[PDB]
A paper describes a structure:
Viral occlusion bodies (OBs), also called polyhedra, are stable protein crystals that encapsulate newly assembled virions within virus-infected cells. The crystalline polyhedra is formed by repeating units of the ~27.5 kDa ToNV polyhedrin protein, which is predominantly helical, containing ten helices and a short two-stranded antiparallel beta sheet. The ToNV polyhedrin structure is almost completely helical, with a 3D fold not previously observed (to the best of our knowledge). The ToNV polyhedrin achieves the first requirement by forming a dense lattice, free from continuous channels, maintained in all directions by disulfide bonds, hydrophobic and electrostatic interactions, and domain swapping.
To generate experimental phases, the wild-type ToNV polyhedrin protein was cloned into an insect cell expression vector before three hydrophobic residues (F104/L105/L137) were mutated to methionine. The native sequence contains only an N-terminal methionine. The structure was determined using single wavelength anomalous diffraction (SAD) data measured using the nano/microfocus X-ray diffraction beamline VMXm at Diamond Light Source that employs a low-background, in-vacuum cryogenic sample environment. X-ray diffraction data for both recombinant selenomethionine derivatised and native polyhedra were measured from protein crystals mounted on cryoelectron microscopy grids. SAD data were collected from selenomethionine crystals, with dimensions between 1–5 microns using a beam size of 3 by 4 (H × V) µm. Due to the small size of the crystals, small wedges of data were collected per crystal and then merged to form a final dataset using data from 55 crystals.
Numbering used by the authors:
A (entry chain A), B (entry chain A): 10 to 164, 178 to 235
Write the structure that this text describes.
Amino acid sequence: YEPNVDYPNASHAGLYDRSKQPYVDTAIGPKTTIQFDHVFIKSDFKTWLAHNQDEAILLIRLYELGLLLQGRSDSFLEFYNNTTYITRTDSKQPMMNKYGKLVDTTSVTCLDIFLSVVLFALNQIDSMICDFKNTPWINLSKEHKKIYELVRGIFYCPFDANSTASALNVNATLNAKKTIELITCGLIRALIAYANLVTAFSADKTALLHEIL
Amino acid sequence: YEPNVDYPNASHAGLYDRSKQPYVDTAIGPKTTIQFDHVFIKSDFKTWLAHNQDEAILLIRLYELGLLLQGRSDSFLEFYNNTTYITRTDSKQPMMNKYGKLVDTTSVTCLDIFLSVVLFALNQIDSMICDFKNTPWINLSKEHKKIYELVRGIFYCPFDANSTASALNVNATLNAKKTIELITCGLIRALIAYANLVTAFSADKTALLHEIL
Ligand SMILES: [Ca+2]
Ligand SMILES: [Ca+2]
């Protein structure tokens, strides 16, 4: 028995509400709901995207990578269209635009496709790192060389300059390993984000199952 | 148009089937399905548990940790009951027993509870590692000291022995950092497992939504 939970708008007009953005939790529209068969629920998945915009854009970047790895040529090549500006703005402008459209996407069908492509990219990257690290001598399969360079892209000895030649040979592996440490840190952050986001989506679907009955 | 996909048992009697365990894919029972409101689907989630038993037991261990961190005292303290043997067997025997019961669990309601507790444990561990690493000097919050020791548990200088005293002071941090590297590797593996498992569960729920209509 918790009237403050049944009546959240009335609760927000009290003296003991500590919410950071009162009343946002009852705003209803495409940006805060999902639907299956045009039955709507207020979506934990949409709330996550709003609370965690920074990580959501990291996952959108993975979607773009997934598209290229699935040969979705047109989707990939048009992914930065319709940005309007002829000048620089946010460094992540095309990703920010897609984030807005993802927030606007209500159908479970379309959101299933999004998470499926992101997970495909995450598994591809994990498989490439396992291959990198399975022997101290670095040897990658053909497909994993491609994944290595794709992730790397979509994301001197002043005392005796002649000695830099030897330094470069020694350092080639340090640079590759540094790339993999960076990719590994990005993957852990993307995985913790994905785990939480898809659990929120899973809980939203239970809510839909309850309501569709 | 793919008759071999509509008629998988007939396909398994052909000359071009490469499946590793033909006919397993049409076995129907509690161990291969889930249900909502007693509407059943053949479950990707159950197939994952069967293909990935090793990782499933890692996630079950996280459930047990989650229980202790949520104060579920009775569930925790009884979690190794009913093992029958008075001798040693599989090193993971109580976890193996629980794995069998998880595979036997059909209701979406109960499986939601499982994943929710596991995710709680994963987030707790990630938060503890972020705290460990946020300064080179190691300082953990009170709650994170507890999480550090819980995860660590649930999972000499022969030339001049006197010098070991100094060695131990130097090595205390190396041991703690080694623990965190080990925990970090376990977390990445648990996260990649969880990502795939809960996506399979999410896809199963879409299948249920389609069928419940
Ligand atoms: Ca290799
Ligand atoms: Ca700290």
